[PDB]
Design a protein around this ligand. Structure first.
Ligand SMILES: C=CC(=O)N1CCC[C@H](n2nc(-c3ccc(Oc4ccccc4)cc3)c3c(N)ncnc32)C1
Ligand SMILES: C=CC(=O)N1CCC[C@H](n2nc(-c3ccc(Oc4ccccc4)cc3)c3c(N)ncnc32)C1
Ligand SMILES: [Mg+2]
Ligand SMILES: [Mg+2]
Ligand SMILES: [Mg+2]
Ligand SMILES: [Mg+2]
Lengths: 192, 189
């Protein structure tokens, strides 16, 4: 009993547009929302949850540090990015993971499309859990191949103390942790 | 190394604005980005663990219509922090408004980013326990904000990822990425 009635363009940039969304609320009253959408009419992207498994060591979660212009600061994130021209989620996952980290991994699982920020945008991603065989030579000396203007520092953090490692990074190096990463670190503790 | 050079307004809405951000890259080249912003940390998301004697713990989630998405999304209770409000007060207030439960603080994250490729939106993630043995959390009544309409869905922590998968298979609705990320780690632990 709620639905979109109309979308009116407010402002279109190269990558991102702002829209006045009109919609019916449940009382039968009409209401507006300001909404963001891409200029490029599938989920939009993938985030990879990369579990670096090496025997006789803790499993690690591989994260990336990048400068994020909207945040005007460095942010710690799961490797992620846009699914490219008719490409599958899984394959965008391995690719992004290689481009961003150098690791070559195997799919363990793939989420349905999930919303990034539904109070603001219609951005959806697939979250893909990937195990990295860290005892295979391909992953011995992993080589990041980042595309034009992509500057990405890898940080692998033990999965055993993930939440504590994340909080320490915020307290020390004043960077921001992504909410999906934080959510995952929390649940590792909460499963107790 | 890298830093913001300038922010030039493209368009101002009542609530959100689009800006052209110019930043210094690490090679020392000037670059641009399109960034969304509002007109502390903006908000809270509540992780509500319903605890009851002789029950498995539940995670309390809300279903709401999300205009940006064109349909209904399953979320952690979440809302903006009012001026002068603490994250924890907001968390508890939003939880009660959205679900009817009165919770107790367990923990509060640092500010974390929602969508850093797009906005500077940050939240605190606030873990709250709900004493479901207490008489006030027996028949909880939502008291939603102005133009706010919520259904409550409580799922066992010990089965969250599977129960979310079911809901997505049976209904026409999206799970939020933070919810789905939490359900995954539960299974991975
Ligand atoms: C060469 C490579 C490259 O630079 N790329 C790769 C190709 C273009 C990328 N891009 N595109 C974005 C962007 C797009 C989508 C975003 O979320 C969504 C929003 C609404 C609905 C769905 C998703 C967020 C951000 C972003 C920007 N706001 N400004 C500047 N450019 C950046 C960057
Ligand atoms: C129930 C409550 C209520 O009705 N309110 C009263 C209070 C105002 C609320 N509001 N505001 C928003 C909004 C603001 C910012 C958003 O993201 C960002 C947050 C921080 C930094 C960057 C981005 C997303 C959404 C939203 C809208 N985009 N359209 C229309 N109004 C809605 C509406
Ligand atoms: Mg990326
Ligand atoms: Mg990438
Ligand atoms: Mg809310
Ligand atoms: Mg609310």
């Amino acid at each position: 009993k709620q639905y979109i009635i109309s979308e009116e363009l407010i402002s279109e940039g190269k990558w991102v547009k702002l829209e006045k969304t009109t919609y019916m609320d449940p009382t039968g009253k009409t209401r507006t929302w300001e909404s963001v959408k891409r200029t490029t009419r599938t989920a939009d992207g993938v985030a990879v949850i990369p579990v670096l498994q090496r025997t006789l060591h803790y499993e690690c979660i591989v994260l990336v540090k990048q400068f994020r212009p909207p945040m005007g600061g460095y942010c710690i994130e799961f490797p992620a990015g846009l699914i490219d021209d008719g490409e599958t989620p899984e394959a965008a996952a391995l690719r992004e993971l290689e481009e961003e980290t150098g690791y070559k991994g195997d799919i363990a699982e793939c989420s349905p499309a999930v919303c990034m920020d539904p109070g603001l945008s219609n951005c959806t991603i697939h979250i893909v859990t990937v195990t990295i065989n860290g005892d295979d030579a391909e992953n011995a000396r992993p080589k990041p191949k980042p595309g034009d203007g992509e500057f990405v520092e890898v940080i692998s953090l033990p999965k055993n103390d993930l939440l504590q490692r994340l909080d320490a990074l915020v307290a020390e190096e004043h960077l921001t942790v992504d909410a999906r990463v934080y959510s995952y670190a929390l649940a590792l503790k909460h499963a107790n």
